[PDB]
Amino acid sequence: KKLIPILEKIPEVELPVKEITFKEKLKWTGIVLVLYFIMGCIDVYTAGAQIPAIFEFWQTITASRIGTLITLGIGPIVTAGIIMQLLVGSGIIQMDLSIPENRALFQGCQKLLSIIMCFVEAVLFVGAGAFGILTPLLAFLVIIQIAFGSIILIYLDEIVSKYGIGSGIGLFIAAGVSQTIFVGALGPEGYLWKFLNSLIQGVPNIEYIAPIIGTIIVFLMVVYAECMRRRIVVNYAKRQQGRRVYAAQSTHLPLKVVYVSNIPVILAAALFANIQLWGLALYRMGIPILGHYEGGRAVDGIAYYLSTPYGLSSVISDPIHAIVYMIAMIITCVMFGIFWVETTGLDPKSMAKRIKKSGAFVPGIRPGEQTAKYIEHRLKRYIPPLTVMSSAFVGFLATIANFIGALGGGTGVLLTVSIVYRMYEQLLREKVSELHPAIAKL
Amino acid sequence: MIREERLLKVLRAPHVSEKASTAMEKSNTIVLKVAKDATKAEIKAAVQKLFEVEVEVVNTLVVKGKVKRHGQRIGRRSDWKKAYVTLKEGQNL
Amino acid sequence: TKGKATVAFAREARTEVRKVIWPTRKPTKDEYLAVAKVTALGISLLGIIGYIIHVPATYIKGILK
Amino acid sequence: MKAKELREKSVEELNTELLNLLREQFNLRMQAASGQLQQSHLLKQVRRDVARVKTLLNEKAGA
Amino acid sequence: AAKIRRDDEVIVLTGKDKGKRGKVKNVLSSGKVIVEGINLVKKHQKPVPALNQPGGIVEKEAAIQVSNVAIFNAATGKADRVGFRFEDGKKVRFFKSNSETI
Amino acid sequence: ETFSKIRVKPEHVIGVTVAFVIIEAILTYGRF
């Protein structure tokens, strides 16, 4: 038995078997995209227009804008996904998700908990004094609104996940970071214009262009991190032989790598988002257990040594802080990467053997250049690093991306660039092989 | 006049594909089209200027078994080498 | 233990394999400019569509608080 | 036709031969042996280039 | 010689292609030339080794005659006989009667 | 797939989200 009765009573999106055209999928993604940004621009009903600063850390990973309808963003959905990866991944629950039973029960449970986290995080946020009026009536009203907008985002994820292009959760983070940059540089508080105005003002301010430069360095750095050429042809064809006739082979290659170890470092950063949140919440409504705060953010404790330095420039004042945080993030990334081994990962051994039944035939040439086994290894050299083995590396890269600092978050840029790249090609993807495919690569 | 760059121009291809690529094209032991008589000399000393291998066993064998290259037309086999040396190192790649 | 040693070793060989992935050119910066273009092209659309709404939307939230 | 090069002396023909005849099949005709040429045309002037080395050796007497 | 060139506003005289003018993008040697857009044709886009194999009968350019053609000359649509050997570092045609490259 | 009994058209959750937008846009702003 499980939590079945109320699990049934969670709504779920009604997926069609009917055609969704590429045009329709793109358009469906775009309506959701606009609904997201809309909720980022409407502030919650609170009579208190006063809000005590921001949590600078939280917004990037969470894909949230504090004080809006989506104050709470994709935060809870991630927080719940943390906890399932924790429990099924440690083998505290040993679930083998091979059966559609435990696959669906991994997922449906996590959704149910997603919803639990939606209010738990909503209550935790106001408890952490993120609106500065703790009038219990108005506080109750605000908690409703903050969590419900995250619930909308659970459902909007499902829509994009079934009616559109890319994933909801991916898209919302990339959306939020992209917008933070464009506005933060060029908007009505734009750093490019604060800078340019400073030039004209006759006192050039290295500071106002400084978080702009931060972003460019990080963007360049992030993007040269899967550029590489490996390539294998063992897939065979020969059709119409003669070497200026056309060609004669089946012509597979990669050039780009690391591709299921992403969701791990999303989790790793998010875990710290919870601790900085949870600790501050526990601080001004109970006992310091995870640290001491004041001035908004952490100043001490477990919560300080785990805080992110970024915002406009490097922090070189505290080198031990940098060392502990860095070590902490790496090992946290190793941890969710290994739980991306023990619960939800990627295959090589039989991904190996998947291709050889045939290569490509004229019809006429009947392969055995590919050998159906004697290929497992080729795969088991290739994959990972794709669930682990650059989880470490990415967590490193993300951390130092924050020590440089950037606008929209150095790590948020890092995730965004990647989400965008798996996305971009999806926008493009449909068009060529609906002439029936371009072919001859098996 | 003491050696020749002429057999430092010996590279023509590493073998590949299915079985026998495993440590036969990688690690110690490597197999590759090497000249046509090799030389057993500047084919062990042109990797001794590259991996420092004094080569665990320098071998040769010209490579055989049927014409193809249009095997359903008439085929032609020009013939070539598998070096089939064992290198004494393989670690500076 | 050895499980730490083998994991250590398979770093080295995979990096070794980056060494020989290295003079396949990883095209000079043509590879990496390709990702940089289409990534920043993508970040541009999402950010600009977010700008057309957000900046004017806080023009209105500002003019009539 | 008629209209090429600049002529090359045999004190520097020397240097040319160590770059498109030697240590060029270790990087380009090794990497012909490792493909990825959407620049097929470059290779053809590793040949037809040091083929001019020995034309301007026997034709021009090393000049 | 080379009394014709990539520079001809041809109208075509062979059926179903005739009456349609345009420039010769690049000159073929097929007894055909490549004109912008007179050249399109049916094509139940083939399935012979190496193609997409689409849902439908595409159009593809295809290049028309030079054994039954005419060029817009100086102000003429007509041809009044043609020459080659005209001046300069060019080699070029010229027309007879237009007496003039065009 | 998922063992949710309830089937909800995305049109409904799109329009439910529009509901929340119109509600809190004018609950808050347009103070009157």
From Swiss-Prot, chain B:
Changing residue 18 to A: Binds normally to ribosomes; strongly reduces trigger factor binding. The keyword Ribonucleoprotein applies. GO terms for molecular function: rRNA binding; structural constituent of ribosome. GO terms for cellular component: cytoplasm; cytosolic large ribosomal subunit. Changing residue 18 to Q: Strongly reduces trigger factor binding. SUPFAM superfamilies: Ribosomal proteins S24e, L23 and L15e (SSF54189). GO terms for biological process: cytoplasmic translation; ribosomal large subunit assembly. The keyword Glycosyltransferase does not apply. Part of the 50S ribosomal subunit. Contacts protein L29 and trigger factor. Might also contact SecE and probably does contact SecG and SecY when the SecYEG translocation complex is docked with the ribosome. This is Large ribosomal subunit protein uL23. It comes from Escherichia coli (strain K12). The lineage of its organism: Bacteria, Pseudomonadati, Pseudomonadota, Gammaproteobacteria, Enterobacterales.
Swiss-Prot record, chain D:
The keyword Nucleotide-binding does not apply. Coiled coil: none annotated. The keyword Ribosomal protein applies. CDD domains: Ribosomal_L29_HIP. GO terms for cellular component: cytoplasm; cytosolic large ribosomal subunit. InterPro entries: Ribosomal_protein_uL29 (IPR050063), Ribosomal_uL29 (IPR001854), Ribosomal_uL29_CS (IPR018254), Ribosomal_uL29_sf (IPR036049). It comes from the Bacteria. Keywords: Ribonucleoprotein, Ribosomal protein, RNA-binding, rRNA-binding. GO terms for biological process: cytoplasmic translation; ribosomal large subunit assembly. One of its GO terms (molecular function) is structural constituent of ribosome. Disruption phenotype: Cells missing both S17 and L29 grow very slowly and have a rather unstable temperature-sensitive phenotype. Binds 23S rRNA. It is not essential for growth. One of the proteins that surrounds the polypeptide exit tunnel on the outside of the subunit. Contacts trigger factor. PANTHER family: 60S RIBOSOMAL PROTEIN L35/50S RIBOSOMAL PROTEIN L29, LARGE RIBOSOMAL SUBUNIT PROTEIN UL29C. Part of the 50s ribosomal subunit. Contacts protein L23, trigger factor and protein nascent chains. Might also contact SecE and probably does contact SecG when the SecYEG translocation complex is docked with the ribosome. Belongs to the universal ribosomal protein uL29 family. This is Large ribosomal subunit protein uL29. It comes from Escherichia coli (strain K12). The lineage of its organism: Bacteria, Pseudomonadati, Pseudomonadota, Gammaproteobacteria, Enterobacterales. The gene is rpmC.
UniProtKB/Swiss-Prot annotation, chain E:
Keywords: Ribonucleoprotein, Ribosomal protein, RNA-binding, rRNA-binding. Transmembrane segments: none annotated. One of its GO terms (molecular function) is structural constituent of ribosome. It comes from the Bacteria. GO terms for cellular component: cytoplasm; cytosol; cytosolic large ribosomal subunit. Pfam families: KOW, ribosomal_L24. One of its GO terms (biological process) is cytoplasmic translation. CDD domains: KOW_RPL26 (cd06089). The keyword Metal-binding does not apply. Part of the 50S ribosomal subunit. Might contact the SecYEG translocation complex when it is docked with the ribosome. Belongs to the universal ribosomal protein uL24 family. One of two assembly initiator proteins, it binds directly to the 5'-end of the 23S rRNA, where it nucleates assembly of the 50S subunit. It is not thought to be involved in the functions of the mature 50S subunit in vitro. This is Large ribosomal subunit protein uL24. It comes from Escherichia coli (strain K12).
UniProtKB/Swiss-Prot annotation, chain F:
It is found in: Cell membrane. It is a single-pass membrane protein. GO terms for biological process: protein transport. Disulfide bonds: none annotated. Keywords: Cell membrane, Membrane, Protein transport, Translocation, Transmembrane, Transmembrane helix, Transport. Residues 30-32 are extracellular. GO terms for cellular component: plasma membrane. Its main location: membrane. The keyword Transmembrane helix applies. It comes from the Archaea. The chain crosses the membrane at residues 11-29. Component of the Sec protein translocase complex. Heterotrimer consisting of alpha (SecY), beta (SecG) and gamma (SecE) subunits. The heterotrimers can form oligomers, although 1 heterotrimer is thought to be able to translocate proteins. Interacts with the ribosome. May interact with SecDF, and other proteins may be involved. Subunit of the protein translocation channel SecYEG. The function of the beta subunit is unknown, but it may be involved in stabilization of the trimeric complex. Belongs to the SEC61-beta family. This is Preprotein translocase subunit SecG. It comes from Methanocaldococcus jannaschii (strain ATCC 43067 / DSM 2661 / JAL-1 / JCM 10045 / NBRC 100440). The gene is secG. The chain holds residues 21 to 52 of 53 of the full protein.
